[PDB]
Protein backbone atom coordinates (compact mmCIF):
# COMPACT_ATOMS: atom_id res chain seq x y z
CA UNK A 1 0.00 0.00 0.00
CA UNK A 2 1.80 3.08 -1.32
CA UNK A 3 0.98 5.91 -3.72
CA UNK A 4 3.16 7.43 -6.44
CA UNK A 5 3.65 11.06 -5.40
CA UNK A 6 7.28 12.19 -5.24
CA UNK A 7 6.61 15.38 -3.28
CA UNK A 8 3.44 15.64 -1.20
CA UNK A 9 1.83 18.88 -0.03
CA UNK A 10 0.90 18.69 3.65
CA UNK A 11 2.65 21.90 4.70
CA UNK A 12 1.46 25.54 5.04
CA UNK A 13 0.97 25.48 1.27
CA UNK A 14 -2.34 23.65 1.51
CA UNK A 15 -4.80 23.66 -1.44
CA UNK A 16 -5.55 27.34 -0.54
CA UNK A 17 -2.98 27.46 -3.29
CA UNK A 18 -4.94 25.32 -5.79
CA UNK A 19 -5.45 25.53 -9.55
CA UNK A 20 -5.02 22.48 -11.75
CA UNK A 21 -5.81 19.69 -9.31
CA UNK A 22 -6.68 16.36 -10.90
CA UNK A 23 -8.00 14.12 -8.12
CA UNK A 24 -7.96 10.32 -8.31
CA UNK A 25 -9.36 7.61 -5.98
CA UNK A 26 -6.38 6.23 -4.07
CA UNK A 27 -7.17 3.15 -1.98
CA UNK A 28 -5.75 -0.12 -3.32
CA UNK A 29 -2.25 1.23 -2.74
CA UNK A 30 -2.59 4.61 -1.03
CA UNK A 31 -5.75 5.25 1.09
CA UNK A 32 -6.06 8.94 0.18
CA UNK A 33 -6.64 11.34 -2.70
CA UNK A 34 -4.31 10.96 -5.66
CA UNK A 35 -3.58 14.32 -7.19
CA UNK A 36 -1.47 16.20 -9.66
CA UNK A 37 -1.88 19.54 -7.95
CA UNK A 38 -1.00 22.83 -9.56
CA UNK A 39 -1.28 25.66 -7.05
CA UNK A 40 -3.12 28.86 -7.81
CA UNK A 41 -1.06 31.08 -5.56
CA UNK A 42 2.37 31.01 -7.12
CA UNK A 43 2.05 28.83 -10.21
CA UNK A 44 3.47 25.69 -8.62
CA UNK A 45 3.11 21.99 -9.50
CA UNK A 46 2.98 19.18 -6.94
CA UNK A 47 1.57 15.70 -6.32
CA UNK A 48 -0.47 15.70 -3.12
CA UNK A 49 -2.00 12.90 -1.06
CA UNK A 50 -4.49 14.45 1.40
CA UNK A 51 -3.04 13.47 4.77
CA UNK A 52 -3.56 16.73 6.66
CA UNK A 53 -6.13 19.36 7.72
CA UNK A 54 -6.47 22.02 5.00
CA UNK A 55 -5.56 19.14 2.72
CA UNK A 56 -9.18 18.05 3.19
CA UNK A 57 -9.86 21.30 1.37
CA UNK A 58 -7.76 19.86 -1.45
CA UNK A 59 -10.34 17.34 -2.53
CA UNK A 60 -13.21 19.40 -1.12
CA UNK A 61 -12.40 22.73 -2.77
CA UNK A 62 -11.18 21.02 -5.93
CA UNK A 63 -14.30 18.88 -6.35
CA UNK A 64 -17.08 21.03 -4.88
UniProtKB/Swiss-Prot annotation:
Source organism superkingdom: Eukaryota
Q: Which residues of the full protein are shown?
A: 28 to 91 of 98
Q: Which Cys pairs are S-S linked?
A: 3-30, 5-47
Q: Which gene encodes it?
A: CXCL10
Show the taxonomic lineage: Eukaryota, Metazoa, Chordata, Craniata, Vertebrata
Name of the protein: CXCL10(1-73)
Q: Which source organism does the UniProt entry give?
A: Homo sapiens (Human)
